[PDB]
Amino acid sequence: GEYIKLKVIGQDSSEIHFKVKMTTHLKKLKESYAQRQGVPMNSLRFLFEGQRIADNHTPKELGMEEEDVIEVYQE
């Protein structure tokens, strides 16, 4: 299907957007985000509507849609 675009909001209000398919495992997003922030992936927690995003969660499992937000906090 189509990519949806998710906005990842940092603790400093910066944003990096990610295009993922509905079946993509979100570990891939977490790794890319941590790489771009220059920190270990395991130093961060990623939340969707306040709930923890697992490595093998997909947008379909979480009910995500175009322009949904992910918030990143320290682990």
Partner: peptide, 16 residues
């Protein structure tokens, strides 16, 4: 002002 950042999340030939 930050610019927009959009990231796309997308063996017989081996020799080692």
């Amino acid at each position: 002002e930050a610019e927009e950042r959009v990231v796309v999340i997308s063996n017989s030939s081996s020799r080692y």
